[PDB]
Design an enzyme around this catalytic site. Structure first.
Site, PDB file in Angstrom:
ATOM      1  N   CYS A 195      -2.373   0.776 -13.543  1.00 32.58           N
ATOM      2  CA  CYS A 195      -2.418   0.564 -12.057  1.00 32.58           C
ATOM      3  C   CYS A 195      -3.615   1.445 -11.784  1.00 32.58           C
ATOM      4  CB  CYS A 195      -1.168   1.008 -11.527  1.00 32.58           C
ATOM      5  SG  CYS A 195      -0.152   2.305 -12.278  1.00 32.58           S
TER       6      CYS A 195
ATOM      7  N   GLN B 107       6.602   7.738 -10.320  1.00 35.78           N
ATOM      8  CA  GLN B 107       5.858   9.070  -9.795  1.00 35.78           C
ATOM      9  C   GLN B 107       6.683   9.185  -8.422  1.00 35.78           C
ATOM     10  OE1 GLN B 107       2.145   6.808  -9.425  1.00 35.78           O
ATOM     11  NE2 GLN B 107       1.149   8.769  -9.405  1.00 35.78           N
TER      12      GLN B 107
ATOM     13  N   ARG C 107       3.535   2.645 -10.818  1.00 36.03           N
ATOM     14  CA  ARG C 107       3.889   1.170 -10.998  1.00 36.03           C
ATOM     15  C   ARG C 107       3.813   0.650 -12.513  1.00 36.03           C
ATOM     16  NH1 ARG C 107      -0.427  -0.811  -6.546  1.00 36.03           N
ATOM     17  NH2 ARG C 107       0.224   0.711  -4.889  1.00 36.03           N
ATOM     18  N   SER C 108       2.889   1.243 -13.327  1.00 38.07           N
ATOM     19  CA  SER C 108       2.737   0.827 -14.754  1.00 38.07           C
ATOM     20  C   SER C 108       4.098   1.143 -15.563  1.00 38.07           C
ATOM     21  CB  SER C 108       1.660   1.569 -15.301  1.00 38.07           C
ATOM     22  OG  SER C 108       0.403   0.987 -15.012  1.00 38.07           O
TER      23      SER C 108
ATOM     24  N   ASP D 137       0.721  -1.117  -0.165  1.00 37.44           N
ATOM     25  CA  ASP D 137      -0.048   0.034   0.056  1.00 37.44           C
ATOM     26  C   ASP D 137       0.924   1.183  -0.018  1.00 37.44           C
ATOM     27  OD1 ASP D 137      -2.391  -1.301   0.176  1.00 37.44           O
ATOM     28  OD2 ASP D 137      -3.091  -0.384   1.707  1.00 37.44           O
TER      29      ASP D 137
END
Ligand code: JLA
EC number: 3.1.3.48
Length: 283
Positions: free
Chosen positions: A215, A262, A221-222, A181
């Site tokens: 994502c 990010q 994440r992508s 998370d």
């Protein structure tokens, strides 16, 4: 510089935030005018994450062709990816329309439906064989065929039917279920194992349309997934693998979608994944 020793030099000097901010400063800025039209407000999950006009995927519709999705075309590596946001309640039909029209074999999902107590994307595939889904706005039917649950990821076989023509196709759903998370994984081993399973399926290969990867926003994440895949492919193709520059590859990918990677922690994790992955490819 090479990668593994550039890596230890940034760790010892504690300058990951400065490296990452340089990337942000040098990244491309292209217009995203279609994304910002008022009629498309409920088609975007986040107001600050939009596809560029020049690389956006168009739906084959005359009313409204818009979806928050981008084509990342890597010329030297000879790989293409579609990066998209997690589907919204009012875009699940558009999502499967895109999969159909672009002739994709695989869908890669890097998030859970609920994280941090909030919904990160719609439940857009069926959970039981006998309870199929019909998307009336785009005239598609989606059926769960089989499911294989492993410790870090799940693979599903799905059948997508175009109800207008009665044509059917098999779609593979690759779901990485264990990204934490908060933060990034401590080791890249399970992420790399997952990448290799997607590769082995044919879903990334030129005899199919581009893989669809998402994502929640389709940039973090992508971005890590396609950046690691492309860098490892370039290390196999070139005479000098130490010439592969992960920062330059990332800036090339950011010509096609804003914001890929990010956080500085995601940047460090991408280096770690490529470094460890390059040893397994050979030994
Ligand atoms: O010297 C280096 O940094 C170096 C990097 C990558 C590499 N390859 C080997 C061939 C395919 C996988 C990784 C070889 C050497």
């Amino acid at each position: 510089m090479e990668m593994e020793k550039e890596f230890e030099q940034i760790d010892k000097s504690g300058s990951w935030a400065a490296i990452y901010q340089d990337i942000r400063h040098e990244a491309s800025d292209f217009p995203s005018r279609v994304a910002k039209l008022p009629k498309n407000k409920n088609r975007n999950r986040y107001r600050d994450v939009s596809p560029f006009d020049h690389s956006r995927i168009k739906l084959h519709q005359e009313d409204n062709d818009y979806i928050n999705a981008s084509l990342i075309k890597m010329e030297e590596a000879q790989r293409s990816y579609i990066l998209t946001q997690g589907p919204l309640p009012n875009t699940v039909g558009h999502f499967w329309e895109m999969v159909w029209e672009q002739k994709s074999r695989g869908v890669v999902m890097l998030n859970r439906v609920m994280e941090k107590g909030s919904l990160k994307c719609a439940q857009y595939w069926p959970q039981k064989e006998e309870k199929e889904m019909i998307f009336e706005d785009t005239n598609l039917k989606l059926t769960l065929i089989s499911e294989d649950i492993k410790s870090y990821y799940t693979v599903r076989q799905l059948e997508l039917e175009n109800l207008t023509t009665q044509e059917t196709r098999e779609i593979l759903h690759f779901h990485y279920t264990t990204w934490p998370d908060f933060g990034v994984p401590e080791s890249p081993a399970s992420f790399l194992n997952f990448l290799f399973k997607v590769r082995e399926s044919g879903s990334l290969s030129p005899e199919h349309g581009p893989v669809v990867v998402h994502c929640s926003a389709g940039i973090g994440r992508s971005g890590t997934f396609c950046l690691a895949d492309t860098c490892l492919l370039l290390m196999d193709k070139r005479k000098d693998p130490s010439s592969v520059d992960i920062k330059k590859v990332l800036l090339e990918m950011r010509k096609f979608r804003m914001g890929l990677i990010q956080t500085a922690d995601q940047l460090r994790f991408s280096y770690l994944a490529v470094i460890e992955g390059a040893k397994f490819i050979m030994g």
